[PDB]
Design a protein around this ligand. Structure first.
Ligand SMILES: CC(=O)N[C@@H]1[C@@H](O)[C@H](O[C@@H]2O[C@H](CO)[C@@H](O[C@@H]3O[C@H](CO)[C@@H](O[C@@H]4O[C@H](CO)[C@@H](O)[C@H](O)[C@H]4NC(C)=O)[C@H](O)[C@H]3NC(C)=O)[C@H](O)[C@H]2NC(C)=O)[C@@H](CO)O[C@H]1O
Length: 129
């Protein structure tokens, strides 16, 4: 599924990401935009052989099982495929764990480089939330 901006904002808010660990909603929408272009089926391969999955590009090195990242963890206890669903529940619940794990949203490289410090509230302009 390719989400619309406000559509994704509403879903993320429904699922409790707004202000989660202190990160306002626009931070999450900005992160998603640059991680996946709001596309739930986004995938990308990392140099070490791990893969990143879904709207928030969650890394099989740590968070999910894809059976093809040996030595990795599965800290969200889910198949990485569940992170490609039209339904964002699994991605959001896993992102909650990731952002809690010490580095906050710096876990998302596109967020640190493209959203952090910027006017992220603009990403929710016009949305009915
Ligand atoms: C090639 C490329 O850059 N692709 C991107 C992916 O890398 C990226 O996924 C992110 O990947 C990084 C590095 O593997 C990952 O960061 C690591 O996360 C672990 C787990 O949270 C950290 O370990 C924790 O450290 C804290 C603080 O030190 C400890 O308190 C805590 O106990 C540790 N937890 C565990 C379980 O051991 C690592 O320190 C940390 N590594 C670095 C260098 O930051 C992110 O979690 C991955 N992010 C996501 C969303 O999965 C993906 C998104 O950034 O983007 C690709 O481009």
């Amino acid at each position: 599924k390719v989400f619309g901006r406000c559509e994704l904002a509403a879903a993320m808010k429904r699922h409790g990401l707004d202000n989660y660990r202190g990160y306002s909603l626009g931070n999450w929408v900005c992160a998603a935009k640059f991680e996946s272009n709001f596309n739930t089926q986004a995938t990308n391969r990392n140099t070490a052989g791990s893969t990143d999955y879904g709207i928030l590009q969650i890394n099989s090195r740590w968070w999910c099982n894809d059976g093809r990242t040996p030595g990795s963890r599965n800290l969200c206890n889910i198949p990485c495929s569940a992170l490609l669903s039209s339904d964002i529940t699994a991605s959001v619940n896993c992102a909650k764990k990731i952002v809690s794990d010490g580095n906050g949203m710096n876990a998302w490289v596109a967020w640190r480089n493209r959203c952090k410090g910027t006017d992220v509230q603009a990403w929710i302009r016009g949305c009915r939330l």
